[PDB]
């Protein structure tokens, strides 16, 4: 039922951000999600809403929008609604939403999430197969209260009428393997095709995983961001045992151009994605090593750590070719497991970025999040 199965989730997010090239930002966010149930019947009808509000505290950062003078706003926010319709094992949503698909990953790396306006269909009528398609005609950046036309990261000022997509994922092999094929079009800017293989296998105490991906990009229509021709391949491999996980990522961009994506979106589909980049400049070859540990092994359940290092070379940018870069990320995340503060999450992380072709910097963040649900 519409009211029966309705859930309300509120997240309080206190976010401290520092980047030393020392500049600083501190802010408080509120993210309110109201998700109804579905009316009973052949066509079920529902409504989702999202409320976003951020407040500046005394002190990228992209935590808050900037005034024209370059001064961060005191506060910002917006409210979005989406209608939902369900039939059998298929759903259509229309309005404002948070798309999380391989060709369009909504960003939530700062204070409030990026949202999009459009429609999205998910259909699971055949066992193991999920079909998706949709179109988004406006976007609200993570650091904006407003909606604007979409554009590509490679030319953020060149606007498009919208982003269309369709894709399929098939999961099989006792749920161990998944294949994905996706096609997207940012109208008059670029078209992108993507293939993905996910696979996991247990060898004794080890869990071995692979995430292989291939993107192929070209300009579309009027080609407002210029001519584009790119392909990007990555393989991210994991080996887990007990409380430990090890990763090796390998990636290469080829062709005339870098890898394409929608401006403001997250780079997290890419194998070597890190906090401050994903090594997708034209021609760029990169590798990554990563280690994760679950500190329950030291009597600290709820505490998890990650360290990762990535290096890119052969990078072509406007300035020149043969560019090199590296990033090192470290994170400790703690989630309170029990007691009055249960579910409270504290994440502390640090990134060091060095680039032969751009500015070097270190970055420190502390994010304290508390979820309430009723
Ligand atoms: C599928 C696996 O991906 C193949 C492409 O990966 C290329 C390997 O990258 C070489 C890393 O060394 C250069 C980093 O600076
Ligand atoms: C400027 C670098 C300071 C980082 C020191 C390391 C502290 C956090 O590392 C936790 C490693 O977790 C292991 C996984
Ligand atoms: C991993 C370690 C990396 C090293 C980085 C140094 O309510 C919550 C109160 O907020 C507390 C934080 O506010 C203080 C920031 O000004
Ligand atoms: C528009 O409001 C919502 C959107 C979403 C989403 O798209 O994932 C989730 C919960 C919401 O309340
Ligand atoms: C000269 O600047 C850099 C060089 C390298 C390198 O040689 O691997 C890496 C990152 C840099 O920022």
Residue numbers in the entry: 4 to 24, 33 to 70, 76 to 390
Reproduce text from the manuscript describing this model.
In addition to these new structures, we obtained much higher resolution data and more complete structures for OccD1 (formerly OprD; 2.15 Å versus 2.9 Å previously) and OccK1 (formerly OpdK; 1.65 Å versus 2.8 Å previously). As a comparison, the OccK1 pore is slightly larger in diameter than that of E. coli LamB, which is a channel specific for sugars. For OccK channels, conductance values are on average somewhat larger than those of OccD subfamily members, ranging from ∼50 pS for OccK4 to ∼300 pS for OccK1, OccK5, and OccK7. Vanillate, while being transported by OccK1, is clearly not the preferred substrate for this channel since relatively high substrate concentrations (10 µM) and long uptake times had to be used to obtain relatively low specific activities. This result is consistent with previous single-channel experiments, where the affinity of vanillate for OccK1 was found to be quite low (∼2 mM). Notably, while the current OccK1 structure contains two vanillate molecules, they are not bound at positions relevant for transport, confirming that vanillate is not a good substrate for OccK1. An interesting finding is the efficient lowering of OccK1-mediated benzoate transport by octanoate and caproate, suggesting that OccK1, but not OccD1 and OccK2, can serve as an uptake channel for medium-chain and possibly short-chain fatty acids. OccK1 is the least specific channel, also allowing the efficient passage of certain linear compounds such as medium-chain fatty acids. As judged by the inhibition of transport, OccK1 interacts with carbenicillin and cefoxitin. Intriguingly, OccK1-mediated transport is also affected by tetracycline, which is a non-β-lactam polyketide compound that does not have a carboxyl group.
In such microorganisms, the majority of small molecules are taken up by members of the OprD outer membrane protein family. Here we show that OprD channels require a carboxyl group in the substrate for efficient transport, and based on this we have renamed the family Occ, for outer membrane carboxylate channels. As expected from pairwise sequence identities that range from 35%–50%, the Occ proteins share a similar architecture, with a slightly off-center constriction formed by the inward-folded extracellular loops L3 and L7 and residues in the barrel wall. The transport data demonstrate that Occ channels have a pronounced preference for substrates with a carboxyl group, due to the universal presence of a basic ladder on one side of the barrel wall.
